From Swiss-Prot, chain A:
Glycans are attached at residues 6, 116. The gene is ACE2. Changing residue 8 to P: Increases slightly the interaction with RBD domain of SARS-CoV-2 spike protein. This is Angiotensin-converting enzyme 2. The chain holds residues 317 to 442 of 805 of the full protein. Zn(2+) binds at residues 58, 62, 86. Changing residue 39 to A: Strongly inhibits interaction with SARS-CoV spike glycoprotein. Essential counter-regulatory carboxypeptidase of the renin-angiotensin hormone system that is a critical regulator of blood volume, systemic vascular resistance, and thus cardiovascular homeostasis. Converts angiotensin I to angiotensin 1-9, a nine-amino acid peptide with anti-hypertrophic effects in cardiomyocytes, and angiotensin II to angiotensin 1-7, which then acts as a beneficial vasodilator and anti-proliferation agent, counterbalancing the actions of the vasoconstrictor angiotensin II.
Swiss-Prot record, chain B:
The lineage of its organism: Viruses, Riboviria, Orthornavirae, Pisuviricota, Pisoniviricetes. Changing residue 124 to D: In strain: Kappa/B.1.617.1, Omicron/BA.2, Omicron/BA.2.12.1, Omicron/BA.2.75, Omicron/BA.4, Omicron/BA.5, Omicron/BQ.1.1, Omicron/XBB.1.5, Omicron/EG.5.1. Changing residue 197 to V: In strain: 20A.EU1. The gene is S. This is Spike protein S1. Changing residue 6 to I: In strain: Omicron/BQ.1.1, Omicron/XBB.1.5, Omicron/EG.5.1. Disulfide bonds join 2-118, 113-148. Glycans are attached at residues 4, 48, 104, 131, 147, 209, 257. The chain holds residues 14 to 298 of 1273 of the full protein. Changing residue 134 to R: In strain: Omicron/BA.2.75. Residues 54-62, 124-146, 221-237 are annotated as: Disordered. Changing residue 228 to G: In strain: Iota/B.1.526. Residues 1-273 form the BetaCoV S1-NTD domain.
Swiss-Prot record, chain C:
The gene is S. Disulfide bonds join 38-63, 81-134, 93-227, 182-190, 240-292, 319-333, 346-355. Changing residue 180 to K: In strain: Delta/B.1.617.2, Omicron/BA.1, Omicron/BA.2, Omicron/BA.2.12.1, Omicron/BA.2.75, Omicron/BA.4, Omicron/BA.5, Omicron/BQ.1.1, Omicron/XBB.1.5, Omicron/EG.5.1. It comes from Severe acute respiratory syndrome coronavirus 2 (2019-nCoV). The lineage of its organism: Viruses, Riboviria, Orthornavirae, Pisuviricota, Pisoniviricetes. Changing residue 186 to A: In strain: Omicron/BA.1, Omicron/BA.2, Omicron/BA.2.12.1, Omicron/BA.2.75, Omicron/BA.4, Omicron/BA.5, Omicron/BQ.1.1, Omicron/XBB.1.5, Omicron/EG.5.1. Residues 21-243 are annotated as: Receptor-binding domain (RBD). Changing residue 162 to K: In strain: Omicron/BA.2.75, Omicron/BQ.1.1, Omicron/XBB.1.5, Omicron/EG.5.1. This is Spike protein S1.
Amino acid sequence: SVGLPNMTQGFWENSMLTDPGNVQKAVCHPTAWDLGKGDFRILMCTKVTMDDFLTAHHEMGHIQYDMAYAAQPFLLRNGANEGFHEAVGEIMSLSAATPKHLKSIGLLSPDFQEDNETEINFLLKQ
Amino acid sequence: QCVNLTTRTQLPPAYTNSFTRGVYYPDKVFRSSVLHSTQDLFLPFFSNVTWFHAIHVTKRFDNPVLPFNDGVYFASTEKSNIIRGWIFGTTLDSKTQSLLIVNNATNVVIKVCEFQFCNDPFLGVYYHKNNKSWMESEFRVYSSANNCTFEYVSQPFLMNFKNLREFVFKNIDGYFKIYSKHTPINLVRDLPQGFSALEPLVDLPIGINITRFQTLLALHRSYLTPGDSSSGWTAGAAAYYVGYLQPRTFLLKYNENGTITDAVDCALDPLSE
Amino acid sequence: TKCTLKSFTVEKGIYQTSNFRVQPTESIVRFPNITNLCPFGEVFNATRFASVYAWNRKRISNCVADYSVLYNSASFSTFKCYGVSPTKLNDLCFTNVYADSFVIRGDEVRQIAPGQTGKIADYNYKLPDDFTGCVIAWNSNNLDSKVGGNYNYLYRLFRKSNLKPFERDISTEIYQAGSTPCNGVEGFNCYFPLQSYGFQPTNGVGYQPYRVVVLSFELLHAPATVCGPKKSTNLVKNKCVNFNFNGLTGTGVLTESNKKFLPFQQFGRDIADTTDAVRDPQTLEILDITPCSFGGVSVITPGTNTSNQVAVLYQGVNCTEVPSNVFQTRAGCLIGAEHVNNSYECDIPIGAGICASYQTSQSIIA
Ligand SMILES: *[C@@H]1O[C@H](CO)[C@@H](O[C@@H]2O[C@H](CO)[C@@H](O)[C@H](O)[C@H]2NC(C)=O)[C@H](O)[C@H]1NC(C)=O
Ligand SMILES: *[C@@H]1O[C@H](CO)[C@@H](O[C@@H]2O[C@H](CO)[C@@H](O)[C@H](O)[C@H]2NC(C)=O)[C@H](O)[C@H]1NC(C)=O
Ligand SMILES: *[C@@H]1O[C@H](CO)[C@@H](O[C@@H]2O[C@H](CO)[C@@H](O)[C@H](O)[C@H]2NC(C)=O)[C@H](O)[C@H]1NC(C)=O
Ligand SMILES: *[C@@H]1O[C@H](CO)[C@@H](O)[C@H](O)[C@H]1NC(C)=O
Ligand SMILES: *[C@@H]1O[C@H](CO)[C@@H](O)[C@H](O)[C@H]1NC(C)=O
Ligand SMILES: *[C@@H]1O[C@H](CO)[C@@H](O)[C@H](O)[C@H]1NC(C)=O
Ligand SMILES: *[C@@H]1O[C@H](CO)[C@@H](O)[C@H](O)[C@H]1NC(C)=O
Ligand SMILES: *[C@@H]1O[C@H](CO)[C@@H](O)[C@H](O)[C@H]1NC(C)=O
Ligand SMILES: *[C@@H]1O[C@H](CO)[C@@H](O)[C@H](O)[C@H]1NC(C)=O
Ligand SMILES: *[C@@H]1O[C@H](CO)[C@@H](O)[C@H](O)[C@H]1NC(C)=O
Ligand SMILES: *[C@@H]1O[C@H](CO)[C@@H](O)[C@H](O)[C@H]1NC(C)=O
């Protein structure tokens, strides 16, 4: 809806969106892996948590940023500096943290107050 | 792969008085008992047709490279199927394309490639007394094959003069029509006197120019002749004729069933006119 | 009659006004059977293909190509054509078609087009600007990809010169960019021309192997031996219908014949060069062609000053084929006259011994 293209057919069949548990050892650390040949996949044990929601948004933003310059040579398929590659992923999480977005998606109920106390608390937490 | 036939005496060519032969259906249109007149390339009646005889007593084996002006009339006065096929082209080398119609007693192979034929191409068979049957010996028509245009392979089979097979070849509008009529004969004369309407067999569009042709005969290399890489070959009793076509006007007499029974060349005598 | 004679009054007698004729129906068309279309069992459905530089050049000239089975198929991704309409492919003919077959990367399929350039379009396979044909490319990542990455395909990456349209070369000389001479190995300015490709099943769009084929159409002075399928509709007899058999067209009623044609004679004719018999290229049966009925319409009418009732005569037309009694005569069908047995003196000559008159509650009698 923002304007980013869709995902590939290999992103939804190779990513591990479910923690296997004690059946096999697997590190649960969110990292946006870029294989370089169109194989984009996220490695994260995403669960039912708002923090996990924001982390998944950050990982998807990183994947979109990596796919943005996919039509470039190997020496160019990388961020300009060491700060933009993470800022492009963090701005999506900072924008998605608004309560109006969660209310429009379906998480937050329509009946919700808009007092300034919650805004001040969120600003202080940030 | 080319083998030049040695030990051959040169004899002057001969001729014969061809009878009312070389009549074929010009088109595929049925007609009733009514007569018809057409101006297609036909064979003039009572014309000089070159006689090529090849027997062994000095031995004689004549198969030169004859030109192709407007069409040829080929006849097969055989008794053991000595004639194997024909060759058509303009250079007989890798320069241009050439038509090669060869039948190795198993398949009627017709290919249109840029063959580079030899000077004296032929086919050879072998006779084994232990097997009590004949068999092929070698196939040295050409050496290699370049890019082709058309190829065809018939269904597999096995194989005095008591057989006659006529042929008429033409080349107009790229198409190469072939007429044939296999009729049985029983006589000792050179060319029988009679009438036969040749029917169209194939119309393969070679799409290439044809200015010369050559007949491919068979040879024998049994134990009667000394074995040699170039000599020691013999040929049975066989002969073929070559008649050139000319633009004339005939009067075809169609039968009530559609078979041409009689015809008259309106160029020989005033009665025909 | 008043309009043909250019007079408001018509005298007693028989006059010819128009000419009756029968119209055809549905325009039956016939053609021989359609068997052994083309040996497409080794190009569009093959198992093992070659590299981009080892593309095959199989000739398609002696078989009837059917482009409807590929245009209407959903198993292909791109079916673009250039210089020819994709719908009329089965209607026209050709002379020789070159069947290409080579596997290329997903993102490199766009460069395979007339008038385009690129690294692969100029060093491996180039199309001319005047190319007249169609491009076909489908996904093949499900069978061409293997575990561990596919490296069985190679391609040319650098060379001193480009490739001409419809050119194939297997030369593998080393490229030399700088002035330093190369002895046979790589180095500073020496490189190898061939490079192994990579195809993995986990790759996304743009890197998957897409089997793209090129169909070039050429029409030179050679006879057209390759065409497309035709209609070959159904036939019917005992009706006036314009027909179109293999090589000719006509109009007339067909019927079951009894003649015995020759195995090679297809058409039939007779004196004065009139087509009267054609064979069915599917049933191998002979049909007698008969021209549909036609005749000059004659209007028998008395004097206008006497009466206005008129009679119609269809000369040579049977009464069963005309569409107030109806009486059939040897001269044709007569409509509007009552047949009587009394023999009077001939007043208006009709033909074949029959005459008309205006006698007694009052009409015209034949
Ligand atoms: C059969 O005879 C022909 C005719 O002489 C030979 O063809 C010649 O081959 C030589 C090769 O040295 C050429 O220099 C000549 O120009 C050729 N002549 C012609 C007319 O083509 C052929 O080599 C002979 N074949 C064998 C096996 O002896
Ligand atoms: C030649 O290609 C055709 C493609 O049109 C193949 O036809 C397909 O065959 C498979 C299995 O045989 C079917 O599942 C498809 O539905 C067919 N496609 C059609 C009918 O459009 C055909 O099998 C190929 N021939 C060979 C020998 O491989
Ligand atoms: C051409 O027309 C049709 C097209 O399939 C076929 O006609 C068959 O002919 C055979 C022999 O004459 C009959 O036994 C069949 O009943 C006919 N119909 C079918 C559906 O097979 C056949 O292919 C051709 N007809 C010929 C050669 O007569
Ligand atoms: C045929 O050739 C012979 C010589 O072989 C000659 O005497 C005769 O006149 C020729 N006939 C014709 C019609 O040319
Ligand atoms: C005749 O030649 C054809 C083509 O080379 C071949 O397929 C066939 O086996 C041959 N027949 C024989 C040698 O009897
Ligand atoms: C002739 O017989 C021999 C002995 O078995 C055999 O090897 C050879 O092939 C036969 N030749 C034929 C059948 O042409
Ligand atoms: C075959 O190769 C020759 C070689 O020059 C070429 O001229 C010709 O166009 C090619 N194709 C045909 C059908 O002869
Ligand atoms: C045959 O020769 C004529 C005369 O020059 C030429 O126009 C024609 O192109 C030739 N045929 C072929 C197939 O080249
Ligand atoms: C022609 O056909 C008829 C009828 O089938 C037959 O009797 C006759 O023998 C055939 N041949 C000739 C020459 O009439
Ligand atoms: C008209 O058709 C009928 C019906 O078959 C027939 O009996 C009659 O002879 C035909 N008359 C003419 C003149 O054709
Ligand atoms: C004319 O004569 C025929 C033959 O007997 C008869 O059927 C018909 O009824 C007669 N018509 C009149 C009007 O008498």
